[PDB]
Each structure stands twice: as C-alpha cells, then as structure tokens.
Amino acid sequence: TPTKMATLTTKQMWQTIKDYFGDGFVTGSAPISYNVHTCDMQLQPDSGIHAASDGIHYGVQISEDSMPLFSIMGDTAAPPCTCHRVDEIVKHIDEFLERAPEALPDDGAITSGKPCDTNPDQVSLYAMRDSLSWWVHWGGNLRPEHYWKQIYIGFAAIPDDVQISPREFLDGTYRYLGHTWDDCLSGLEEEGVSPDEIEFANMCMWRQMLTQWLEKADPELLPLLKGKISLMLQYRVLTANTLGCLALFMNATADPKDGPIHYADSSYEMEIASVAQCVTLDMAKEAMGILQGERTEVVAGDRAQRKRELRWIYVRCMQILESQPHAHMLRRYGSAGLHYVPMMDRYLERVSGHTRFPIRDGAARILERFINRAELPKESEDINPNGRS
Amino acid sequence: TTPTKMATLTTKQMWQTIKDYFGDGFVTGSAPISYNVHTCDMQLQPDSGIHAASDGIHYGVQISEDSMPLFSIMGDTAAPPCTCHRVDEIVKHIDEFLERAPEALPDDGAITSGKPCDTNPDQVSLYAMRDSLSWWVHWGGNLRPEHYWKQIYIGFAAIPDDVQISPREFLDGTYRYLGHTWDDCLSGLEEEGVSPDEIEFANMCMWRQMLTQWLEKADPELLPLLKGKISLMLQYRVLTANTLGCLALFMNATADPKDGPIHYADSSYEMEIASVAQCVTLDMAKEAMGILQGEVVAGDRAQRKRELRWIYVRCMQILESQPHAHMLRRYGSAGLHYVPMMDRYLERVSGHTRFPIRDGAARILERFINRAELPKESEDINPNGR
Numbered sequence: 001t002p003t004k005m006a007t008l009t010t011k012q013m014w015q016t017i018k019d020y021f022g023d024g025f026v027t028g029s030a031p032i033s034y035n036v037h038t039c040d041m042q043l044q045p046d047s048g049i050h051a052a053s054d055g056i057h058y059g060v061q062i063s064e065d066s067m068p069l070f071s072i073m074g075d076t077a078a079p080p081c082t083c084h085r086v087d088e089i090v091k092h093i094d095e096f097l098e099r100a101p102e103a104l105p106d107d108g109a110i111t112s113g114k115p116c117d118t119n120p121d122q123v124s125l126y127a128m129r130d131s132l133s134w135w136v137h138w139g140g141n142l143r144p145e146h147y148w149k150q151i152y153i154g155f156a157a158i159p160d161d162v163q164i165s166p167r168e169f170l171d172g173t174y175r176y177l178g179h180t181w182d183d184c185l186s187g188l189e190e191e192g193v194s195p196d197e198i199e200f201a202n203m204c205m206w207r208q209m210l211t212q213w214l215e216k217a218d219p220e221l222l223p224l225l226k227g228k229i230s231l232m233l234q235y236r237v238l239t240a241n242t243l244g245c246l247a248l249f250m251n252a253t254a255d256p257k258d259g260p261i262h263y264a265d266s267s268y269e270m271e272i273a274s275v276a277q278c279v280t281l282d283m284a285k286e287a288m289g290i291l292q293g294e295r296t297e298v299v300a301g302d303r304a305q306r307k308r309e310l311r312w313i314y315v316r317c318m319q320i321l322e323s324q325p326h327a328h329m330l331r332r333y334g335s336a337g338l339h340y341v342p343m344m345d346r347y348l349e350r351v352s353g354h355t356r357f358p359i360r361d362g363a364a365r366i367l368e369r370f371i372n373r374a375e376l377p378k379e380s381e382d383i384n385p386n387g388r389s
Numbered sequence: 390t391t392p393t394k395m396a397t398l399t400t401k402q403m404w405q406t407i408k409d410y411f412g413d414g415f416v417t418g419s420a421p422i423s424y425n426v427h428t429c430d431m432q433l434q435p436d437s438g439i440h441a442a443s444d445g446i447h448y449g450v451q452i453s454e455d456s457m458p459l460f461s462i463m464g465d466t467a468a469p470p471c472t473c474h475r476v477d478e479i480v481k482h483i484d485e486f487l488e489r490a491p492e493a494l495p496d497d498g499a500i501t502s503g504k505p506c507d508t509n510p511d512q513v514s515l516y517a518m519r520d521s522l523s524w525w526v527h528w529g530g531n532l533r534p535e536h537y538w539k540q541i542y543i544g545f546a547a548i549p550d551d552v553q554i555s556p557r558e559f560l561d562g563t564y565r566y567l568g569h570t571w572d573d574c575l576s577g578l579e580e581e582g583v584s585p586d587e588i589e590f591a592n593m594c595m596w597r598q599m600l601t602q603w604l605e606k607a608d609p610e611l612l613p614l615l616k617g618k619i620s621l622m623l624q625y626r627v628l629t630a631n632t633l634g635c636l637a638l639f640m641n642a643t644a645d646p647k648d649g650p651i652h653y654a655d656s657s658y659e660m661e662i663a664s665v666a667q668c669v670t671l672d673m674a675k676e677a678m679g680i681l682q683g684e685v686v687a688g689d690r691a692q693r694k695r696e697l698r699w700i701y702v703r704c705m706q707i708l709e710s711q712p713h714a715h716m717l718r719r720y721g722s723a724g725l726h727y728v729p730m731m732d733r734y735l736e737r738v739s740g741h742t743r744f745p746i747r748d749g750a751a752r753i754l755e756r757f758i759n760r761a762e763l764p765k766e767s768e769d770i771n772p773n774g775r
C-alpha cells in the first residue's frame with residue numbers, strides 16, 4: 001500500500017458523511033439523517049402510579065399540563081410538518097459546495113458573540129471551560145481516563161465560536177489548544193474506545209464541522225431554516241453534535257459489568273435524548289433572556305408559536321425516554337440544559353452584556369492539562385497564565 | 390364519652406406541644422429544633438468513577454465537588470465551623486420571648502412578600518399557590534386530583550413567608566388559605582388516604598413552621614442571634630421552609646405502592662439530608678439570578694457559600710446510597726432547575742413586580758380556591774379561571 005495523503009475537499013467530506021450516515025426517514029436527507037419522525041410522537045397523561053425503578057424518576061420531570069404555570073413557558077402546540085423538505089436543504093448545500101472556494105478569507109474568524117474576544121486560542125480556552133461544565137452537568141467527572149473524550153467535547157464546542165474550515169480541521173492545520181483532530185482520535189484509541197465507536201464519533205464531528213461552517217459561510221442557509229421548526233431543529237442538533245458527544249459520554253459512564261452497549265440498538269433513544277437537550281438549552285436560554293436575537297436563534301420569527309412547538313416536542317421526547325433501556329443516563333442528558341444553562345459562565349456571560357468572566361486560579365489549574373502548550377502559536381504561548389504548577 | 394372541649398392553645402402551648410412531639414435532636418435541649426444528623430461530621434468519599442446503572446448517583450443533578458471552581462457563581466468548598474451545639478441557647482431565648490409576648494400582634498396579617506404591589510392577602514395566597522404547584526412539579530409530582538390536599542399543604546407552607554400569620558389564628562381557623570382552614574387541609578389529607586401518623590407528622594411540621602416563620606417576623610432579636618452561625622442559621626431556615634413536612638407528603642404521593650407507608654421513623658435520616666440539600670440549592674441558584682438582575686462575591690458572603698456548597702455535596706453523596714434516592718436526589722437538587730424557571734424568582738429579578746397569571750395558569754389554580762369562604766374584597770380573585 002503506497003503512502004497516499006491527499007486531503008479531502010469540503011465537497012468530498014460532505015459526500016463521505018452521506019455515504020456513512022445514509023438517508024434518514026426522508027428520502028434524500030443524507031447526511032441530515034434522523035430516525036424518529038417527531039411529528040408522529042404522542043403524549044399520554046401520566047398515570048401517577050410508578051415503580052421505584054421507573055424512568056420518570058431520572059432527569060427533570062415537568063408534565064406538559066403544568067407548563068402554563070411558568071410564565072416563561074406556556075402551553076404546547078403541534079408543529080406543521082416541514083420534515084419532508086430536508087432534501088431541499090441538502091440540494092441547496094450540494095449546490096453551494098459546488099461553487100464555494102476551498103478556502104474563505106474569514107476562515108479562523110471569531111464568532112463567539114463576545115466582542116472582547118480577539119485570540120482564537122483564548123476562545124478555545126473558554127470553550128474548554130464550557131465543555132467540562134456540560135460534561136459535569138450530564139453527570140460526568142473530571143477523571144483522567146476520559147481526558148480525550150473531554151477534548152472531543154472541546155472540538156464540539158469551538159466551531160460554534162470560531163469559523164473553522166472543514167479542510168483545516170481535517171488536515172491538522174487547525175489545532176484546538178494545540179491538539180490536532182487526529183491527536184483526539186489517537187487519544188480515544190488509547191482510552192479503549194472501540195474503532196467502530198470512534199468512527200461514529202468521528203463522522204459526527206465531520207458533520208458538525210461541516211454544518212457549523214456552512215451556516216457561517218452560506219448567507220442563504222439560516223434564512224432557509226428559520227420558521228420551519230422541524231427542519232431548523234434537525235439542523236441545530238447537528239451543529240450542536242449532542243449525538244456524537246452522547247455516544248462518548250455513554251462510553252465513559254456505562255459500567256461494563258452491566259453488559260456492552262449495543263449502539264445500533266440504542267440509536268433511536270440516543271437521537272431523542274440529543275434533540276431533547278437542545279430544546280432545554282433554548283428553553284433555559286429564553287428564561288435568561290439570551291435566546292432572542294442571537295444569529296442562530298432556533299425560534300426566530302413567530303417566537304411564541306415556535307416555542308410552543310419546541311415544548312410540544314420536548315415533553316414527548318422525555319416521556320419516550322422514561323421507557324428506554326438507558327433512561328438512567330439519557331433522561332438527565334435530555335433535560336440537562338435546565339440546570340447547566342443557569343449555572344454556566346458561557347450563558348451568564350451573555351446575560352452580563354456578552355462579556356467574559358475571568359478564569360480564576362481554581363478553574364485554570366483544571367484546564368491546564370488540556371493545553372498542549374508545545375503546539376501553540378507564539379501569540380498564544382501565555383494563555384491560561386494562572387494555571388501552571 | 391368525653392365532654393366537648395375546644396379551648397385553643399396558647400402560642401407557648403403550641404411551642405411546648407411540638408417540643409414533646411419532636412423531642413431533642415443529637416443535641417440535648419434542642420427540642421423542637423431537632424436534627425439527628427450532624428452535618429459537620431459528614432465525610433466526602435472519593436469517586437471511583439464506576440457506577441452501576443442502578444446507582445443512585447444517576448438521580449437528580451450530579452456535580453462533582455472538584456468541578457465547582459469551573460462555575461464563576463460557585464467556587465471551592467470549605468468545612469463550616471460547628472455551632473450546632475449552641476442550639477439550646479436559641480431555644481431558651483425563644484422561650485423567653487413567648488413567656489412575655491402577646492398572643493396577638495399589631496402587624497399580624499401584614500404582607501411581607503417583598504413585592505410592593507401586593508395589597509390583598511388572598512391574591513398573595515394565589516401567587517403562593519402558583520409557586521407551590523411549580524415546586525411540586527419540579528420535585529417530580531403531577532397535577533392529578535388525588536393529591537389536591539397535599540398541594541394545598543404546600544400552599545400553607547409557602548404563605549407564611551409572604552404573610553405574617555399568627556400561629557393561634559392559623560390553628561383556630563381564623564386564618565384561611567384561599568378559603569381553606571388548616572383543619573380543611575388535615576381532613577382532606579385523611580380523605581386522600583394518608584395514614585393518621587403521617588398526617589400528624591406533617592401537621593407538627595406545619596405547626597413548627599408557622600411558629601418559626603412568625604417568631605422571626607415578630608422578635609427582631611432572633612435572626613441577629615442566628616446570623617454568623619451558619620450551622621444554626623441553616624437549621625432554622627430549613628424549619629421555616631418546612632421542606633421536611635412537604636417532603637413527607639411528596640414521598641407519600643410519589644412512592645411505589647408496593648413500598649410500605651413511608652413513615653418518618655423509618656427514613657428520618659435520608660429525609661433530613663434531602664431537606665437540607667434543597668435549601669442549599671436555593672442559595673446556589675439565586676446567585677445566578679443576581680446576575681440576571683443586573684462572580685464578585687467576596688469576604689464573608691463568599692466564605693458562607695463555600696460552607697453551603699461543602700454541606701450540599703456531602704448531603705447529595707449520602708443520598709446516592711439511600712433507599713429512596715429515586716425520589717430524594719431530585720428533591721435535594723431541585724432548586725438548581727426550579728429557581729431559574731419559576732415566576733416567584735423571575736418576578737424578583739424583574740424588579741420585585743408581579744407577572745400576570747395567564748388564562749392557562751388561572752384554569753389550573755381555580756379548583757384550589759374555596760370561593761365560598763373568601764372575604765368579599767377577594768371574591769373577584771382569579772377572574773380568568775373559569
């Protein structure tokens with residue numbers, strides 16, 4: 001086998017994840033591929049009689065009929081089904097990638113929404129803070145055996161706040177806190193994640209990098225999604241990559257004694273949990289007054305109705321999760337935004353005028369080991385200055 | 390038979406009654422401020438990082454202690470100093486107050502909600518009913534009618550924080566919560582199948598709450614006496630919040646029916662722990678609400694919060710292995726998601742105003758109002774609720 005090393009074009013990456021993920025329930029949807037048709041989900045009144053081991057006891061439980069009690073919530077309403085037009089979103093992207101250049105002049109630009117950000121590695125450092133904060137609220141710990149899974153969460157965070165070229169992410173030109181993407185894959189191998197598991201998380205990361213970049217590079221894409229909650233929700237869950245992060249979180253959290261995780265068998269419950277968390281993310285952001293106005297706002301337009309539709313989907317996602325095999329992990333994952341948004345600096349910084357909170361010594365010492373200082377550029381050599389020992 | 394006697398208890402006899410019921414805690418002479426668990430002796434065990442699917446750690450919100458520095462509204466933790474052995478001095482002072490205090494004060498009935506637009510105490514009760522259902526739901530409960538009177542109980546537990554209620558008027562039926570006397574609630578709990586011994590425990594917890602909520606508003610020398618003594622202030626706040634009595638009824642509504650009736654004698658340990666933990670989450674989440682209101686915490690406040698977090702993480706870790714972790718873990722950490730979502734706290738962030746009760750919420754609250762026993766000035770309460 002002669003050593004070949006040509007890097008894929010952005011168009012070829014898009015085609016690769018098409019071949020890997022295939023179509024979802026809408027023909028022509030690859031790689032925007034979902035198993036569950038949210039519009040066909042049902043919700044039953046709770047019986048009020050539950051066994052001690054029932055899934056309802058996990059996560060945060062808020063019955064649909066109680067939501068009008070919270071002024072920041074309200075009632076629910078079924079959305080109009082726009083799912084079948086996802087193939088039109090794909091064809092649009094296909095056309096955009098056919099004409100877009102392999103490199104944009106603003107690749108590497110900061111898109112965090114916090115104007116005091118000027119160094120992309122400092123933005124990465126704040127993203128590592130955020131990543132560990134999510135991980136903890138999902139139920140995880142900071143133990144060293146999950147280092148590279150936590151780095152994965154960082155890679156999943158940073159393309160939201162920096163415009164990362166998919167090619168540069170792929171070919172190692174882009175580094176997150178000094179790490180290339182391949183470093184993360186190699187580290188996951190060292191941590192014992194199986195090859196097929198790594199490749200799934202890998203393809204989810206390609207898809208995240210691609211969709212994060214597309215919505216920054218294509219001025220028509222976000223306008224095409226807004227107003228169509230089914231399509232917008234499908235897209236925003238890809239840019240958040242809750243599914244890829246979930247797969248690795250399950251790997252880190254499951255006890256091998258309970259038997260191995262059959263991930264294909266769990267694909268539906270995992271998807272539902274990933275969608276549910278993104279809804280609680282925006283539900284809690286709305287309660288903090290930081291959802292309205294952001295460029296990627298999921299509920300833009302008729303905000304009141306779009307939010308009714310999100311709540312409609314959320315309660316149905318959560319009820320289904322009560323009865324899934326991995327409810328002891330996925331219920332909390334699905335509702336985690338309700339407690340991590342009000343506590344995390346990422347969001348309180350937005351409440352506070354889109355500023356930056358200082359990273360105190362305690363947090364800096366945590367973040368230090370996640371920095372590969374040897375591979376930082378000269379202008380970033382002194383990030384996290386209070387975290388060294 | 391026995392002749393019909395109906396004399397109402399004096400506020401001292403109320404205080405003495407709950408002393409005989411609750412007895413002393415782990416400190417002698419601490420009745421009725423009785424806690425069996427000494428929070429200062431708690432020890433945090435190391436996290437092996439391996440937890441079975443059935444492990445209680447999966448319930449509620451799990452935040453490892455060593456990760457708390459990542460959050461600017463939090464930080465690290467530090468053990469509190471032990472002042473819980475001075476609780477007997479708090480009792481004897483209260484005795485002194487009640488041996489020279491009237492049975493009726495001038496400002497009994499005044500509104501203490503902290504929201505200046507409140508003028509009608511029955512409207513204040515309506516907002517408290519909204520808050521009560523919101524807590525109940527965030528603990529994990531539902532709105533099914535078989536728990537109506539347990540939800541009324543939460544209302545009785547909420548309202549003494551927002552209205553100065555005389556313990557004797559709460560007892561004799563003079564005070565009505567949305568038209569309900571206290572006896573109406575007790576009678577309803579019986580009709581709902583709560584065993585007599587459970588009702589009486591919840592009853593005595595409500596007696597104790599009404600007394601302590603009234604003592605702190607009446608005696609200006611009580612709270613200053615508590616301030617600076619974190620372990621005593623925390624014990625007193627839990628009594629005035631009545632998380633324990635509310636927990637008892639929530640557990641009764643939520644427990645597996647194959648579970649034998651869960652009596653405080655069986656589970657006093659886990660119930661106290663969970664009751665303390667939830668009150669700490671109030672302090673933790675309210676700091677985030679300060680930012681919303683428009684990180685810099687320092688000095689004694691910052692030290693206070695270090696000690697509350699220390700208690701919280703140790704309480705939550707203990708709940709991992711308790712038999713009712715599938716209920717109490719969520720109860721213990723519930724403030725972390727209900728404070729940022731509830732009107733009660735968003736109203737304060739928004740300038741201590743009041744949010745309108747919209748049609749959907751009014752229709753939920755309607756059935757909790759005994760309109761037949763409302764005063765005339767309150768007959769138009771909850772107008773959009775039919």
Ligand SMILES: C/C1=C\CC/C(C)=C/CC(C)(C)/C=C/C1
Pocket residue numbers: 134153156157158160161239240241242243245277278281
């Ligand atoms: C799976 C992740 C978190 C949960 C959802 C969320 C809040 C995403 C935001 C961002 C895209 C920045 C990070 C993704 C990492």
Ligand SMILES: C/C1=C\CC/C(C)=C/CC(C)(C)/C=C/C1
Pocket residue numbers: 524543546547548550629630631632633635667668671
């Ligand atoms: C057990 C209760 C709620 C949870 C804790 C809390 C937020 C108390 C506030 C107040 C004392 C007004 C009500 C008590 C009812």
Ligand SMILES: [Mg+2]
Pocket residue numbers: none
């Ligand atoms: Mg065009």
Ligand SMILES: [Mg+2]
Pocket residue numbers: 160239240296
């Ligand atoms: Mg985004």
Ligand SMILES: [Mg+2]
Pocket residue numbers: 160296
């Ligand atoms: Mg974003």
Ligand SMILES: [Mg+2]
Pocket residue numbers: 106216217
């Ligand atoms: Mg551009």
Ligand SMILES: [Mg+2]
Pocket residue numbers: 550629
């Ligand atoms: Mg109070």
Ligand SMILES: [Mg+2]
Pocket residue numbers: 550
């Ligand atoms: Mg209060």
Ligand SMILES: [Zn+2]
Pocket residue numbers: 037038039040080081082083084230
């Ligand atoms: Zn649809």
Ligand SMILES: [Zn+2]
Pocket residue numbers: 427428429430470471472473474620
């Ligand atoms: Zn002590």
